[PDB]
Design an enzyme around this catalytic site. Structure first.
Site, mmCIF file in Angstrom:
data_model
loop_
_atom_site.group_PDB
_atom_site.id
_atom_site.type_symbol
_atom_site.label_atom_id
_atom_site.label_comp_id
_atom_site.label_asym_id
_atom_site.label_seq_id
_atom_site.Cartn_x
_atom_site.Cartn_y
_atom_site.Cartn_z
ATOM 1 C CB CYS A 1 0.164 32.284 31.124
ATOM 2 S SG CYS A 1 0.522 34.026 31.353
ATOM 3 C CG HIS A 2 -4.676 32.367 33.832
ATOM 4 N ND1 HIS A 2 -5.919 31.975 33.496
ATOM 5 C CD2 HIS A 2 -4.089 31.285 34.490
ATOM 6 C CE1 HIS A 2 -6.122 30.712 33.932
ATOM 7 N NE2 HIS A 2 -4.998 30.295 34.536
ATOM 8 C CB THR A 3 -0.598 37.501 30.958
ATOM 9 O OG1 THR A 3 -0.095 37.335 32.281
ATOM 10 C CG2 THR A 3 -0.360 38.946 30.468
ATOM 11 C CG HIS B 1 3.382 36.879 27.434
ATOM 12 N ND1 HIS B 1 2.130 36.348 27.367
ATOM 13 C CD2 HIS B 1 3.844 36.655 28.713
ATOM 14 C CE1 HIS B 1 1.807 35.830 28.570
ATOM 15 N NE2 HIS B 1 2.842 36.056 29.411
ATOM 16 C CD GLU B 2 4.429 32.008 29.685
ATOM 17 O OE1 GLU B 2 4.874 30.857 29.809
ATOM 18 O OE2 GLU B 2 3.504 32.446 30.395
ATOM 19 C CB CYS C 1 17.530 49.638 26.762
ATOM 20 S SG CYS C 1 17.841 51.061 27.900
ATOM 21 C CB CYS D 1 16.934 53.741 30.217
ATOM 22 S SG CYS D 1 16.448 52.277 31.164
ATOM 23 C CB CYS E 1 19.340 49.736 32.068
ATOM 24 S SG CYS E 1 17.904 48.955 31.224
ATOM 25 C CB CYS F 1 14.373 48.476 30.757
ATOM 26 S SG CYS F 1 14.855 49.178 29.147
ATOM 27 N NE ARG G 1 6.677 51.169 31.043
ATOM 28 C CZ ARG G 1 5.905 52.030 31.717
ATOM 29 N NH1 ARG G 1 6.175 53.332 31.681
ATOM 30 N NH2 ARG G 1 4.866 51.581 32.438
ATOM 31 C CB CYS H 1 5.757 34.532 31.396
ATOM 32 S SG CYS H 1 4.279 35.096 32.330
ATOM 33 N NE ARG I 1 2.768 29.785 31.867
ATOM 34 C CZ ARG I 1 2.174 30.313 32.939
ATOM 35 N NH1 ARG I 1 1.213 29.668 33.609
ATOM 36 N NH2 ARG I 1 2.574 31.490 33.385
HETATM 37 N N1 LIG Z 1 4.673 40.245 38.793
HETATM 38 C C1 LIG Z 1 4.926 39.752 37.554
HETATM 39 O O1 LIG Z 1 5.878 40.152 36.913
HETATM 40 C C2 LIG Z 1 4.079 38.629 37.015
HETATM 41 C C3 LIG Z 1 2.841 38.378 37.605
HETATM 42 N N2 LIG Z 1 2.037 37.388 37.211
HETATM 43 C C4 LIG Z 1 0.804 37.239 37.958
HETATM 44 O O2 LIG Z 1 0.938 36.117 38.866
HETATM 45 C C5 LIG Z 1 -0.404 35.704 39.193
HETATM 46 C C6 LIG Z 1 -0.544 34.174 39.076
HETATM 47 O O3 LIG Z 1 -0.311 33.709 37.739
HETATM 48 P P1 LIG Z 1 -0.436 32.150 37.368
HETATM 49 O O4 LIG Z 1 0.184 31.255 38.391
HETATM 50 O O5 LIG Z 1 -0.191 32.035 35.884
HETATM 51 O O6 LIG Z 1 -2.029 32.051 37.642
HETATM 52 P P2 LIG Z 1 -2.955 30.779 37.869
HETATM 53 O O7 LIG Z 1 -4.346 31.240 37.560
HETATM 54 O O8 LIG Z 1 -2.356 29.623 37.131
HETATM 55 O O9 LIG Z 1 -2.939 30.440 39.417
HETATM 56 C C7 LIG Z 1 -3.791 31.148 40.311
HETATM 57 C C8 LIG Z 1 -3.993 30.277 41.522
HETATM 58 O O10 LIG Z 1 -4.534 31.033 42.626
HETATM 59 C C9 LIG Z 1 -5.544 30.239 43.264
HETATM 60 N N3 LIG Z 1 -6.493 31.130 43.935
HETATM 61 C C10 LIG Z 1 -7.427 31.941 43.350
HETATM 62 N N4 LIG Z 1 -8.061 32.644 44.295
HETATM 63 C C11 LIG Z 1 -7.531 32.273 45.485
HETATM 64 C C12 LIG Z 1 -7.749 32.651 46.866
HETATM 65 N N5 LIG Z 1 -8.709 33.564 47.100
HETATM 66 N N6 LIG Z 1 -6.964 32.119 47.824
HETATM 67 C C13 LIG Z 1 -5.998 31.215 47.525
HETATM 68 N N7 LIG Z 1 -5.751 30.805 46.274
HETATM 69 C C14 LIG Z 1 -6.472 31.310 45.249
HETATM 70 C C15 LIG Z 1 -6.162 29.387 42.168
HETATM 71 O O11 LIG Z 1 -6.719 28.217 42.817
HETATM 72 C C16 LIG Z 1 -4.939 29.120 41.291
HETATM 73 O O12 LIG Z 1 -4.241 27.929 41.732
HETATM 74 C C17 LIG Z 1 -1.338 36.464 38.237
HETATM 75 O O13 LIG Z 1 -1.873 37.647 38.837
HETATM 76 C C18 LIG Z 1 -0.435 36.913 37.138
HETATM 77 O O14 LIG Z 1 -0.849 38.096 36.467
HETATM 78 C C19 LIG Z 1 2.446 36.526 36.232
HETATM 79 C C20 LIG Z 1 3.701 36.702 35.628
HETATM 80 C C21 LIG Z 1 4.519 37.776 35.983
HETATM 81 ZN ZN LIG Z 2 16.754 50.339 29.866
HETATM 82 ZN ZN LIG Z 3 2.708 34.416 30.836
#
Ligand SMILES: NC(=O)C1=CN([C@@H]2O[C@H](COP(=O)(O)OP(=O)(O)OC[C@H]3O[C@@H](n4cnc5c(N)ncnc54)[C@H](O)[C@@H]3O)[C@@H](O)[C@H]2O)C=CC1
Ligand SMILES: [Zn+2]
Ligand SMILES: [Zn+2]
Ligand SMILES: NC(=O)C1=CN([C@@H]2O[C@H](COP(=O)(O)OP(=O)(O)OC[C@H]3O[C@@H](n4cnc5c(N)ncnc54)[C@H](O)[C@@H]3O)[C@@H](O)[C@H]2O)C=CC1
Ligand SMILES: [Zn+2]
Ligand SMILES: [Zn+2]
Lengths: 378, 378
Positions: B46-48, B68-69, B98, B101, B104, B112, B116, B176, B371
């Protein structure tokens, strides 16, 4: 104008417990202050009606016009009424919402005491008399609604104003069992996605709980009924496992605990039987299980359990109209039905007329109905 | 036995930002105390991953094994490891659990801190060194996982033990985007039945939010994306209305407010763009609206709004891995997938091999993947 005038109309009068209802011509007085006269187009019947008709209801008063699940059109309103007017489409509700009492103001309950001192004894608040009569003698109201009639008069705090395009032969069910069931899940229990649920009793209430659970994202939805024919029917409402207590020697709670390796996250009792209510509590999971009593037990009946059940993390609670505020939220449920987000149609097994109401009650008595709807024109 | 021994295996090494990944033979050291060596069978990208590969990640460290996936099978465990053993099917998670901590133990968060300090700088806690090398020189770990390899070594506090019958080419996605999206609805926001929701960004995260909302019982699920082709795809995941900001001169928040007569009950930003994050907050309803930031913005980027937005009842929050505790709840999500209660398969648009990883990244770069899953055997 019929407005300001007495209206003569058809209504099913119950004169005595267990006797056939008689379809009389009755006089419906005009509405006084705070009252609403409604042309009832369709009314459903349920066991709450039959219970009182069978003379088992200690608050039952004869002669009376039964019925509490209806939809219609406002004919006229009394002095001071502002939230509905002539022509509005409405669902009269047995549960008021005055918005001014300490219960309504609390923000912590949907119970409202405002008119229950009059509706509990078959009369109106304004003058402590009934609006129904035959041959000059009064007929009691029932549950503040009296919907087994072409016209009724109800308190304005009991009238939900609904979407004028809704089908009135369907949304009459949103005054009783369906909201009770859905809201038992959504409001009282607040079932989370992935929860396992047990539902005891698969009538209309139980099936609405199953729909509620399904919509809320529940995983295992286990139905429990002494009639195994209810399972096939219940599947469309979301029940996905079934247990008939008769197929097991062990108490049903132990059966459910075994099936779920510890118990369900939520249980709902939708019968009104104190022993099943206890079973529903005891089949909840240690630590976090919650049981909701939806069933309405007979007078003097008591629920029991051992306190260790609660000390070890189970929570016992119950619901009144699913925790929905009638005037505010019945319109919202109608909107959800119009948007195909809640079922209503599928609960209606038969459609008869007010003239055939005695036949409707026979259908009800034999367990053949989920909900039987009556057209009041014939 | 490979156990106690170095293992030579294939892995995709990133040596420099933006350069093609090279498929080397690498040495994977055996696990030390608290560590788990896993035979990775399938890994998604993924994009990460791409973000760090493109050299934009301030924590990025080269040379490294990204990824990571994943899902795989435990080959061996180090001293003291008891929750998994050789042969267990596992999902390594970038988010540890864990259980010891103050985070947790809090009961108030899924974050956690335990490992890290090592995983943030591409090494293991036990000896503050890496387990990967080529030609005697170390290769950094990435996100405590490094799943672009036939074998990786991860901390035991990062390994979720899963149902051994689950398909490993599907459940690799439960490490993820899918949990992040589902749990943003279920855990962070706690969306109630009948809620109206806006989702900004319809990638994998956004589509998982839509599935989460759908499962939770949401009514209007409004998707917002600058690519209109995403709407057709998004419908199966539950999106039922769509707005492309480009079709409107007005700011997108005003558009959503107009569409909903006041705003949504919940919004989710699934892009990582601070201006859209603000829009997602400002399209929430006065009094009770809540916005959840799921997107991960670049360093130094700031979100802004006017305080009156919050003073008038909107709530701003965010989510990290959907609020799921990895070791405890990833297994639970696998169970839900096996019971057909959550989608996973439908997010996988392509299946390639680890050998074709550079081609996978081209697919990722052109927006062609939701994906893309990689078989690590070829
Ligand atoms: N909070 C967390 O724990 C996690 C966060 N993420 C984050 O979630 C976000 C999305 O990840 P994915 O779905 O894999 O990304 P993705 O790149 O597959 O999807 C992004 C989407 O946003 C759209 N987009 C871009 N700019 C836009 C705008 N200005 N207005 C409306 N739509 C727009 C694109 O057309 C695309 O469909 C990323 O920032 C990623 O880092 C991902 C996993 C975990
Ligand atoms: Zn912990
Ligand atoms: Zn991912
Ligand atoms: N709390 C509230 O606000 C409201 C409560 N109710 C109550 O909900 C309850 C159910 O109403 P409906 O569904 O209309 O009734 P119903 O009579 O249509 O359904 C009852 C069901 O329970 C089953 N049953 C009976 N004994 C059983 C047992 N021992 N174990 C398992 N199943 C058993 C029957 O087979 C039947 O399917 C009633 O007590 C009614 O008064 C109804 C509306 C509102
Ligand atoms: Zn009823
Ligand atoms: Zn009140």
């Amino acid at each position: 104008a019929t407005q300001g005038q007495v209206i003569t109309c058809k209504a099913a009068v119950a004169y005595e417990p267990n006797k056939p209802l008689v379809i009389e011509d009755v006089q419906v007085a005009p509405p006084q202050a705070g009252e609403v006269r409604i042309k009832i187009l369709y009314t459903a019947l349920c066991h709450t009606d039959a219970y009182t008709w069978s003379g088992k209801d200690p608050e039952g008063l004869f002669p009376c016009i039964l019925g509490h699940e209806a939809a219609g059109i406002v004919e006229s309103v009394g002095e001071g009424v502002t939230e509905v007017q002539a022509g509005d489409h409405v669902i009269p509700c047995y549960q008021a919402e005055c918005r001014e009492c300490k219960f309504c103001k609390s923000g912590k309950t949907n119970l409202c005491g405002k008119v229950r001192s009059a509706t509990g004894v078959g009369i109106m608040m304004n003058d402590r008399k009934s609006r129904f009569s035959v041959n000059g003698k009064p007929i009691y109201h029932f549950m503040g609604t009296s919907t087994f009639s072409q016209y009724t008069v109800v308190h304005d705090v009991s009238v939900a104003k609904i979407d004028p395009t809704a089908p009135l032969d369907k949304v009459c069910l949103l005054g009783c069992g369906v909201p009770t069931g859905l809201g038992a899940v959504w409001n009282t229990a607040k079932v989370e996605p992935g929860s396992n649920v047990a539902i005891f009793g698969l009538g209309t209430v139980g099936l609405a709980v199953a729909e509620g659970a399904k919509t809320a994202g529940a995983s295992r939805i286990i139905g429990i009924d002494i009639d195994s024919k209810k399972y096939e029917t219940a599947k469309k409402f979301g029940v996905n496992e079934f247990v008939n207590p008769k197929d097991h020697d062990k108490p049903i709670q132990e059966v459910i605990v075994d099936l779920t390796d510890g118990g369900v996250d939520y249980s709902f009792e939708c019968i009104g039987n104190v022993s099943v209510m206890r079973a529903a509590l005891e089949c909840c999971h240690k630590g976090w299980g919650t049981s909701v009593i939806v069933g309405v037990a007979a007078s003097g009946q008591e629920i029991s359990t051992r306190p260790f059940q609660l000390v070890t993390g189970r929570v016992w609670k119950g619901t009144a109209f699913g925790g929905f505020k009638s005037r505010t939220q019945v319109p919202w449920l109608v909107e959800k039905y119009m948007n195909k987000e809640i079922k209503v149609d599928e609960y209606i097994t038969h459609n008869l007329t007010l003239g055939e109401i005695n036949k409707a009650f026979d259908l009800l008595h034999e367990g053949t109905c989920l909900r039987c709807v009556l057209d009041t024109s014939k």
